[PDB]
Amino acid sequence: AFAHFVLIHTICHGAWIWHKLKPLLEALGHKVTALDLAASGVDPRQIEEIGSFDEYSEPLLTFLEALPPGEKVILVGESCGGLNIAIAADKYCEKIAAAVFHNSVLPDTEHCPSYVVDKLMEVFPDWKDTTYFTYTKDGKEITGLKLGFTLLRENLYTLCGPEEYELAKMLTRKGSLFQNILAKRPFFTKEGYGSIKKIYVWTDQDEIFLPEFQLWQIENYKPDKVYKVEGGDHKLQLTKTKEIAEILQEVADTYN
Amino acid sequence: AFAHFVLIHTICHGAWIWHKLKPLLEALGHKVTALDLAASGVDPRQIEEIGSFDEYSEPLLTFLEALPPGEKVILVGESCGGLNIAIAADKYCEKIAAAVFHNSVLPDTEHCPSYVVDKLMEVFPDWKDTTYFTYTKDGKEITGLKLGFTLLRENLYTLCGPEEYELAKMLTRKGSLFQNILAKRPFFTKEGYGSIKKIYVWTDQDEIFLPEFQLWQIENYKPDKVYKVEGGDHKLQLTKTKEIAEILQEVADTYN
């Protein structure tokens, strides 16, 4: 079967991270949309204009809003993109056939929206040469970050080629986790987000979303299906692109 | 010998086009700077803010202005980047060891600055699915363009892999040739631009800067050295990355 996959990058990244996977999925016959979220990739906004993870999610919400009635998509979120998935599913659950988490945060409905980010920061406290700053938006102080090039090289792009790591150095931008804003956000709903099918894809060789974290997330909020990819690195859509496409094909054949 | 290469993308592109060549040059021991020009790549400006090719060149001029006395670079410009080279050389000629034209326009000092663009538009009049718009800046009507995806696929990225063409679809932005502004600009100077060493690199399999155009440019304004790369496509830094590095090494060993 064919599906429309909507690929959702993580903070400080853009659609460009999907530049290998998107043509491969298209070569299997799928439709693929790879969005730039707010203040990401070639989006014209800067992060200091964005006040919350919800506002950061606008391009995804707008895209979903534009789907004609009856059209459903499979969302695919990497790393912090799982929070964009949860936000989207609480507005447009009827348009989501399934959500695929790709070395991603997996929010739940019983704890506040910051819960799995808080845990991530306990498991992986040292972001190496990443730099931080603060800005104010809508009366709140927001911590921005710019991912350090050593962190990128060693922990996110560990096994990626030099030409892929170069893209990351060139294209990663200032971003934010909006952790303190998530901490005060209404909880993700059982009727929206809680109802969607959730497929969790990961590798135990991820050097930033470490096994203790990912296995903690799976036990915290049981996915409908788990796929473990052997080898690769945090950026499985670069290091294990074919295996990810293979998994996404199966998802398309299972969930509609 | 080692050099500091400054890589200059063409209109509608960004530093990202150099993502294969930059690490290769670094693997030979060079220093490499790959800039985003105004309103290009992840630069925060939009094209409608930019009024001339000189203003478009600002990041290059600022970078050159920041070089301490005595430091010289080798500029490398692809496609329309040769006009950024000429603008830069009329301000900072003493900081330029050489300029390398990479399937690039080659402005001169005897004709107005638009001369080789006017000729390009005669040789290659049909930009396929490229779209155009107009905006006004500093009292002039400027023609903007967004490169068509068929043009990209067939004429610029002809032999590039699907994952490279995908990057182009994702990351190319609205831009401008500023042709009518170039047409009224003071001529490039003999003392500045005219004095710099000019190395012209091309392939006769370029499907947009066609052989008639490139050979016309070489006869119009004789380069100090010509290198013809066999095969590849317009984006030689993607299809012939090693050959381009090889040539740039020789340039570094010849010109300082």
Curated annotation (Swiss-Prot), chains A, B:
Positions contributing to acetone binding: 10, 79
Coiled coil: none
GO molecular function: aliphatic (S)-hydroxynitrile lyase activity; aromatic (S)-hydroxynitrile lyase activity; methyl indole-3-acetate esterase activity; methyl jasmonate esterase activity; methyl salicylate esterase activity
pH relationship of activity: Optimum pH is between 5.3 and 5.7.
InterPro entries: AB_hydrolase_1 (IPR000073), AB_hydrolase_fold (IPR029058), MES/HNL (IPR045889)
Applied value in biotechnology: This enzyme can be used as a biocatalyst for stereoselective synthesis of a wide array of (S)-cyanohydrins by addition of HCN to aldehydes or ketones. Optically active cyanohydrins are interesting intermediates for the synthesis of alpha-hydroxy acids, alpha-hydroxy ketones, or beta-ethanolamines, all of which are important building blocks in organic synthesis.
Activity regulation field: Inhibited by hexafluoracetone and rhodanide (thiocyanate). Also inhibited by trichloroacetaldehyde via a covalent link on Ser-79. Susceptible to several serine, histidine and cysteine inhibitors: is strongly inhibited by diisopropyl fluorophosphate, diethyl pyrocarbonate, HgCl(2) and parachloromercuribenzoate (PCMB), to a lesser extent by iodoacetamide (IAAM) and iodoacetic acid (IAA), but barely by AgNO(3) and PbNO(3).
Catalytic activity: a monosubstituted aliphatic (S)-hydroxynitrile = an aldehyde + hydrogen cyanide; a disubstituted aliphatic (S)-hydroxynitrile = a ketone + hydrogen cyanide; an aromatic (S)-hydroxynitrile = an aromatic aldehyde + hydrogen cyanide; 2-hydroxy-2-methylpropanenitrile = acetone + hydrogen cyanide
Feature type site, description Increases basicity of active site His: 206
Record carries keyword Transmembrane helix: no
Post-translational modifications reported in the UniProt record: The N-terminus is blocked.
Effect of residue 9 to A: Almost no change in catalytic activity in crude extracts, but the purified mutant protein is inactive
Active site per UniProt: 79 (proton donor/acceptor), 234 (proton donor/acceptor)
E.C. no: 4.1.2.47
Domain AB hydrolase-1: 4-240
Variant or mutagenesis effect after changing residue 234 to A: Loss of catalytic activity
Keyword terms: Lyase
Effect of residue 235 to L/R: Loss of catalytic activity associated to substrate reorientation
Function: Involved in cyanogenesis, the release of HCN from cyanogenic glycosides in injured tissues; the release of toxic HCN is believed to play a central role in the defense mechanism of plants against herbivores and microbial attack. Decomposes a variety of cyanohydrins (alpha-hydroxynitriles) into HCN and the corresponding aldehydes or ketones; two natural substrates are 2-hydroxy-2-methylpropanenitrile (acetone cyanohydrin) and 2-hydroxy-2-methylbutanenitrile (2-butanone cyanohydrin), but in vitro can also act on mandelonitrile.
UniProt similarity note: Belongs to the AB hydrolase superfamily. Hydroxynitrile lyase family.
Assembly and oligomerization: Homodimer or homotetramer.
Protein name, UniProt field: (S)-hydroxynitrile lyase
